[PDB]
Every structure is written in C-alpha cells, then in structure tokens.
From a paper:
The highly oxidising protein [name] catalyses disulfide bond formation between two cysteine residues of unfolded substrates in the periplasm of Gram-negative bacteria. Like many other thiol-disulfide oxidoreductase enzymes, the active site of [name] is comprised of the characteristic CXXC motif (Cys30–Pro31–His32–Cys33 in [name] [name]) and a highly conserved cis-proline in an adjacent loop which has been shown to play a key role in the binding of substrates. Adjacent to the active site is a hydrophobic groove which serves as a site for both DsbB and unfolded substrates to form a complex.
The co-structure showed a horizontal rotation relative to the unsubstituted phenoxy 25 (comparable to 16) but notably a less pronounced shift into the left-hand side of the binding groove, meaning the π-stacking interaction between the benzofuran core and His32 could be better retained. The m-methoxy group of 26 may potentially form a polar interaction with side chain of Gln35, although electron density for this compound was insufficient to unambiguously define the interaction. The addition of a m-methoxy 26 substituent on the 6-phenoxy group led to a 2-fold decrease in binding affinity, while extending the phenoxy group to a benzyloxy group led to a 2.5-fold decrease.
Numbering used by the authors: 1 to 188
The structure:
C-alpha cells in the first residue's frame, strides 16, 4: 500500500478517547520545530489540505528548556487565550533560538509587548485561571500520548505522523507528503 502503518505514520497502542482531530506539539526550544514553523510552514500547509473549518490544535510542551520551557508553555496558553499566536510565534522562536534574547519570563513578556499586547492585558491573562486551565490542557494532551519528543502530530488520537519515513532532499516535496499524509489519516 502507498500509505502503511509503520511507514508514514504509526498507530498508538492506546488510542486517546476524545482527542483533537489534528493535534500538533512543539517547543520553542526545539530546533526541528523552528524549521517546521519558519522554513517548512508545516501547520499552514496541513491546514490548506484539510476541509475548511476543520479544527487544528497546536500545544507547547514542558520537557525542553527546564524552567523557561514551562514559562513558554504558560505564555503559549496566554497566546491561545488572547488569539495572538500568529503575532508571537516567530519572535518567540527567534528570541529563543536565533538571537537568544529570551532568558527569563520577563523577556517572554517583552515579545508580547513588542507585538502590541498591552501589559495589563498580558499580565491579567498570565495570572488567570483560564490560562491555568489551558496549561493543564496542553499538559494532559501530551501526557495522553506519553509524549517524549517534538515536533509531533497526532490525528484523531489514533495515528502519529512519522516524518523520518519521508525524503528530505527537497523541502517542498517533504511538506506536501506530510500534509497529504495528515489528509489521508484524517479520512481514515
Ligand atoms: C530544514 O528542516 C527540515 C526540512 C525537511 C526535512 C527535515 O527532516 C526532518 C524534520 C523533522 C524531524 C524529526 C522530528 C524529531 O524527532 O525531532 C525527526 O527526524 C526529522 C527529520 C528537516
């Protein structure tokens, strides 16, 4: 078969009941995740191959970056709560991995301020229980699949993308294979 379990994807031994349709995990510390966002634009190319309105979910993880990694999961919860993911993803990636100007929770806040989020608005969200709940959600989703590495994408809580089984000589061909595999899995 053109798509087969163990090749472009694997099948979770313990399916996760009631998981998002398309669930992506990343870390702002993760070098491949940097490539996935700035160079390959995986999330956008998956979205363009799914039916309009389909829910794509992207969550941050704690297991990279120690203390600052946990701060970044909370800041991503702030980003999701405020709807400003598209405003802070690039400057957070570049702050952690390119310029290395993000060394504290205050430096993370600076990124939001520079992106136009008001300080009182950021601080109110940071300390809110809605954000605490969004942190819990991100952690639970990762725990549900015993997540030990990123980037990762899961489809319907049953299938995990396997990008190691794809040619990488051409960046554009790899992206479309990835997105076509998500589409195929979403139609299973
Ligand atoms: C410029 O960046 C690119 C572009 C195209 C292909 C490519 O190849 C990859 C991408 C991600 C991963 C992972 C994910 C992990 O396990 O961290 C494992 O092997 C990988 C191989 C990298």
């Amino acid at each position: 078969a053109q798509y087969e379990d163990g090749k472009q994807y694997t099948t979770l031994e313990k399916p996760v009941a009631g998981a998002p349709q398309v669930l992506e995990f990343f870390s702002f510390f993760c070098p491949h995740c940097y490539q996935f966002e700035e160079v390959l634009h995986i999330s956008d190319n998956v979205k363009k191959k799914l039916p309009e309105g389909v829910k794509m979910t992207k969550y941050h993880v704690n297991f990279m970056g120690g203390d600052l990694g946990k701060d970044l999961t909370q800041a991503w919860a702030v980003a999701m709560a405020l709807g400003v993911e598209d405003k802070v993803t690039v400057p957070l990636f570049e702050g952690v991995q390119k310029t290395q100007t993000i060394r504290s929770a205050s430096d993370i806040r600076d990124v939001f301020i520079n992106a136009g989020i008001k300080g009182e608005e950021y601080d109110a969200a940071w300390n809110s229980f809605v954000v605490k709940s969004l942190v819990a959600q991100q952690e639970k989703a990762a725990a549900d699949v015993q997540l030990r590495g990123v980037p990762a994408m899961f489809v319907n809580g049953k299938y995990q993308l396997n990008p190691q089984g794809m040619d990488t000589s051409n960046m554009d061909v790899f992206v479309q294979q990835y997105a076509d595999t998500v589409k195929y899995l979403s139609e299973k």
